Amino acid sequence: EMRLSKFFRDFILQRKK
């Protein structure tokens, strides 16, 4: 499906926790 959305899911969500 995506390539970056897991990385974005890794961290991004947790940058702005």
Q: Would you list the DSSP string of 1-17?
A: --SSTTTIIIIIHHHT-
Q: Give whole-number Cα distances, 17 to 1, 2, 3, in Å.
A: 25, 22, 22
Distance, first Cα to last Cα, the chain? 25
| Residue in the structure block whose two tokens are 């990385």 | 7
6: its two tokens = 């897991």
Experimentally, the structure was elucidated by NMR
| Dist. CA 3–CA 5, nearest whole Å | 6
| Dist. CA 15–CA 2, nearest whole Å | 20
| Dist. CA 15–CA 17, nearest whole Å | 6
